[PDB]
C-alpha cells in the first residue's frame, strides 16, 4: 500500500491522522507514507475537495493508494474496514 498526507491542519486533534499514518509505517512493514505540501505543489482547499470528489473542508487530507479517505477519524475508519475490520 502507499499513504499520502496532503497539507496541514495544525490542530492537534486532526494531526492525530498524520501521527497515525507515520506510526502505522512503523507497525506495518510494507506501506510507506509520504507527506506532501499544498504550499509547494500549489493546491487549494477547493482543489482538494474537487480532486477528493466531495466538499471536504476538514483537514488534513490523507490519501491511501491514491484514494481520498478524509480526515483522522475517516482514516481510522478506512484502516478498519480495509485492515482491522
Ligand X SMILES: *SC[C@H](NC(=O)CC[C@H](N)C(=O)O)C(=O)NCC(=O)O
With CB under 6 A as the contact rule, which of the stretches 19-27, 30-38, 40-48, 68-76 interacts with ligand X?
A: 68-76
Q: Does 69 bind ligand X (CB under 6 A)?
A: no
Q: What is the DSSP letter of 80?
A: I
Residue nearest to ligand X (CB): 71
Interface positions, 8-67, toward ligand X (CB under 6 A) = 9, 11, 13-14, 58-59
What is the rounded CA–CA span in Å between residue 38 and residue 31?
22
Sequence-distant (6+) residues with CB within 8 A of 44 are 38
| Residue 83: CB minimum distance to ligand X, A | 19
Sequence-distant (6+) residues with CB within 8 A of 78 are 64, 69, 70
If the CB atoms of residues 25 and 58 are measured against ligand X, the closer one turns out to be: 58
Sequence-distant (6+) residues with CB within 8 A of 9 are 15, 58, 59, 60
Number of residues that bind ligand X (CB under 6 A): 9
**Which residues here bind ligand X, judged by CB under 6 A?**
9, 11, 13-14, 58-59, 71-73
Amino acid at each position: 500500500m502507499q499513504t499520502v498526507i496532503f497539507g496541514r491542519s495544525g490542530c492537534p486533534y486532526s494531526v492525530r491522522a498524520k501521527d497515525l499514518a507515520e506510526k502505522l509505517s512503523n507497525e506495518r512493514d510494507d506501506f510507506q507514507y509520504q507527506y506532501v505540501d499544498i504550499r509547494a505543489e500549489g493546491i487549494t482547499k477547493e482543489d482538494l475537495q474537487q480532486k477528493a470528489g466531495k466538499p471536504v473542508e476538514t483537514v488534513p487530507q490523507i490519501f491511501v493508494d491514491q484514494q481520498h479517505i478524509g480526515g483522522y477519524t475517516d482514516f481510522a475508519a478506512w484502516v478498519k474496514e480495509n485492515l482491522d475490520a
